[PDB]
């Protein structure tokens, strides 16, 4: 029959109070004859009624998926409360249950560094700024870029990578125009991580 | 029953004529009661008899794993010959075949940069040298470090990461004592890739 998977909120949504973190329950391979799925939600075994549930046609392989996202309180995630979805359908003998909560573990704040472009790039039209975020636990982190205050979108980062000392690091590569590098005052690597004071740390660099 | 997985040689073994690349077939979930397995190997459907096979007791879940590695010629892998293992066992109705060969893809040679430590890190007891390798296809690459000729093993790299332009990049971080950053004359990032001349490029950095 159908399978069910549960997912934690995005770490950025958890650490940014103006955003809405959500726990997600996904019912995969729902039968088309039988698309009625009831998904109910529990926070520490207390039922809640705020989840938004949608059916999606998966055109990759012509299947159906039902996705339920429960909006949650940030502090409830951080303080270790259990979120649980119960899925009922006809093709299911008994209801299938999934539970998730935040893993209580080692917390270690990252160091954040910005590396200027390599010298070899300074004669080209485009340069790469590198944000190196090092020594954090756990491995969940948001890393974004701005120039002065404006959001920069033309970056990619790596997976968090577990180092030999048991902590993680990540690289983020921002490509911008050498002219922009020359004219713009400042570029900022903005890091959200639970070990940081206020969950937030900005590092800024300028061309000299 | 059991299943069979086939794995390619490691890119470094492929690109260094002095090393021995191997195609590997792994049989998982062979029963403790029937650990015997028959395995044959074919290079372009000619049987070869050079494979090394070891059986492992997987005490974790009381199963058996058989790993067979065929040593292969570099040119045979690079030129796209088909490597095939056929596996039989009591608990398999008919023999399982797995095949593998090198994909004929785009080959794009990367640029290699070495970045010095970020300025804010030079106070510490250890500094990080960053090797940034940008714009390669396919995404198989070997990145290693030397100080002059001598191997420097205290490094971790990211996965290759697929960029915006459909090429890959990768970061490699070598951590070193700040004292060696000031004493040692040179550190080298050594990149082996299909698209590089002689499959090898060395980039070198010193403190200035
Ligand atoms: C038909 O096709 C569909 C679609 O297939 C996919 O899409 C196409 C286009 C191609 O890319 C396919 O190759 C794709 O696969 C098939 O559906 C898929 O079915 C799989 C089942 O066979 C199922 O498998 C794995 O799922 C998770 C990983 O899921 C994430 O990554 C997948 C990519 O690998 C994605 O497909 C998923 O979408 C999912 O991605 C995450 O999604 C969440 C929720 O949307 C999202 O979080 C939310 O994001 C919001 C913003 O977008 C916001 O932030 C919200 O607040 C937030 O909540 C994530 O951000 C997003 N991340 C990414 C990177 O995309 C695996 O975990 C799972 O493994 C577990 O189960 C197997 C057993 O089956 C075990 O072997 C395995 O070890 C795991 O077991 C678990 O182990 C841990 C620790 O070991 C334990 O703690 C757990 O208890 C234990 N759990 C269990 C249950 O055992 C699966 O391997 C895919 O999710 C699913 N995809 C979708 C989209 O539904 C379908 O199968 C096909 N049908 C047929 C008949 O063939
Ligand atoms: C009982 O337990 C065992 C052990 O379980 C593990 O250990 C315990 C303690 C726990 O930690 C568990 O969580 C662990 O799982 C279970 O065995 C496991 O069974 C899995 C299947 O049930 C099997 O699954 C995946 O295997 C490969 C990945 O394998 C590599 O990565 C793993 C994770 O890193 C490693 O652990 C593996 O050992 C393996 O590592 C690779 O090993 C090769 C071979 O040695 C090595 O290459 C050689 O290396 C040499 C140097 O040492 C030298 O360089 C040689 O030249 C070189 O050849 C590699 O270096 C190394 N690689 C890496 C990355 O580390 C997955 O690829 C595979 O995925 C496929 O299957 C599913 C479904 O088909 C798909 O989602 C997926 O896309 C793949 O499908 C493929 O898709 C393509 C197209 O996209 C098709 O063309 C393919 O044909 C298609 N394949 C098929 C078959 O259709 C599996 O998901 C685990 O490997 C295996 N673990 C071990 C250690 O054997 C067992 O299941 C349990 N039994 C139970 C519970 O009943």
Author numbering:
A (entry chain B), B (entry chain A): 237 to 444
Structure paper excerpt:
Immunoglobulin G (IgG) is a crucial mediator of the defensive mechanisms for eliminating infectious microorganisms. To gain mechanistic insights into the molecular process behind these interactions, we attempted to observe the dynamic interactions of an anti-GM1 monoclonal autoantibody, GB2. Our study visualized antigen-dependent assembly of the GB2 antibodies on model membranes, giving rise to hexameric ring structures, which particularly interacted with C1q.
We solved the crystal structures of the Fc fragment of GB2 and that of the same IgG isotype in the absence or presence of the B domain of protein A, respectively. In the crystal, the apo form of Fc formed a trimer but not a hexamer, confirming that the ring formation is an on-membrane process mediated by antigen-Fab interaction. Intriguingly, the mouse anti-GM1 IgG2b(κ) antibody GB2, in which positions 345, 430, and 440 are occupied by alanine, glutamic acid, and threonine, respectively, were highly preorganized into the hexameric ring on the antigenic membrane formation without artificial mutations. In the wild-type IgG2b, the hexameric ring formation occurred exclusively on the membranes containing specific antigenic molecules and did not occur in solution.
